[PDB]
């Protein structure tokens, strides 16, 4: 269908991939750093979801450079993807409002 709905879909699939890759890379970057908690996959995945949604619980976060880099990619992909949906919903509303104006 329309570009905005495809982009939304694409963004979602992409986000889910970043989430998974992010979980795997966080563990890899963090293991080896004393005091690190982002070291098992199940919670790292919870961490990536937390991060991508910016929910801010603060129960887990990276302590290494590479882990922080992985964090930036994840949050940014999350902010962007959700902003994309917002933009897609606006395109939907703007298009329907034009119709409701018989023009």
């Amino acid at each position, epitope marked *: 269908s329309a570009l905005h709905w495809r982009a939304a879909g694409a963004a979602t699939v992409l986000l889910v991939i970043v989430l998974l890759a992010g979980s795997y890379l966080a*563990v890899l970057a963090e*293991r080896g750093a*004393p*005091g690190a908690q982002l*070291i098992t*996959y199940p919670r790292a995945l919870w961490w990536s979801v937390e991060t991508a949604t910016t929910v801010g619980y603060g129960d887990l976060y990276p302590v290494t450079l590479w882990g922080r880099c992985v964090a930036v990619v994840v949050v940014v992909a999350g902010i962007t993807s959700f902003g994309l949906v917002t933009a897609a919903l606006a395109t939907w509303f703007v298009g329907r409002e034009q119709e409701r104006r018989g023009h």
Partner: antibody
Framework: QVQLQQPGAELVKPGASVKLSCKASGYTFTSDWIHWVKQRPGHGLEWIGEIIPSYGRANYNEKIQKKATLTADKSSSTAFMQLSSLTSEDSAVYYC???????????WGAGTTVTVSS | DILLTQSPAILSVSPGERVSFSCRASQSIGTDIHWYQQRTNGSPRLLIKYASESISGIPSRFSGSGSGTDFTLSINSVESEDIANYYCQQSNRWPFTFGSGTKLEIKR
């Protein structure tokens, strides 16, 4: 069947250096980590280090003198541990274990009794 | 590093009694503790993961409890086959660490 296989023993002369092996079998995920644990007679379990085969990245217990080096042959599903310049202090049973990246060692090898002696 | 204290080091129980092994961490670690059993000259065997989750193939009389810094591994009605060393292990913070272990001893 036996998921981890280690040679029962290895004899090493002081200053020498042996390479222990750990052949794995059963379900193999990319997320698997192989750990190595040292147990001196009488004493308890001491974590040595870890390695993730699907990347070759390894980490070591930095609280103890570093005498190990880990590598892994993805082809033959085998983990290797290179111990170098051993002394009487390095004689003990070395276990290897498999961790599915979720924090616990589900399965351990039978362990290799390394004896450093002339 | 996270210190895992297992005290007392030796437990003397009578056949059939209920025994309780203790594991105290130096800092809070949720329920990220795991229990292993090691018999004379055998290798470690996972008995309980994440503080209280039973593992398949382990006698129902084995269980664990606790969270934070105090953990307990309990055995309802001990028996000769249970005689061994019991270690706790933590996966909350890097690196993973093991308690010093407690030997179970049956007074028959």
């Amino acid at each position: 069947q036996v998921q981890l296989q280690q040679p029962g023993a290895e004899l090493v002369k002081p200053g020498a250096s042996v390479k222990l092996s750990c052949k794995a079998s059963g379900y193999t995920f990319t997320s698997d980590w192989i750990h190595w644990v040292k147990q001196r007679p009488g004493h308890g379990l001491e974590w040595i280090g870890e390695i993730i085969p699907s990347y070759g990245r390894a980490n070591y217990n930095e609280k103890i003198q570093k005498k190990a080096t880990l590598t892994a042959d993805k082809s033959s599903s085998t983990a290797f541990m290179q111990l170098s310049s051993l002394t009487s202090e390095d004689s003990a049973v070395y276990y290897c274990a498999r961790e599915r990246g979720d924090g616990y060692f589900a399965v351990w090898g039978a362990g290799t009794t390394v004896t450093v002696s002339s | 590093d996270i210190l895992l204290t297992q005290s007392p080091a030796i437990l003397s129980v009578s056949p059939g009694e209920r025994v309780s092994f203790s594991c105290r961490a130096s800092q809070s670690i949720g329920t990220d503790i795991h229990w292993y059993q090691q018999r004379t000259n055998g290798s470690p065997r996972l008995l309980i993961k994440y503080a209280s989750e039973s593992i398949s193939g382990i006698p129902s009389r084995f269980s664990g409890s606790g969270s934070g810094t105090d953990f307990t591994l309990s055995i309802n009605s001990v028996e000769s086959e249970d005689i061994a060393n019991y270690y706790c292990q933590q996966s909350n913070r890097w690196p993973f660490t093991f308690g010093s272990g407690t030997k179970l001893e049956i007074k028959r």
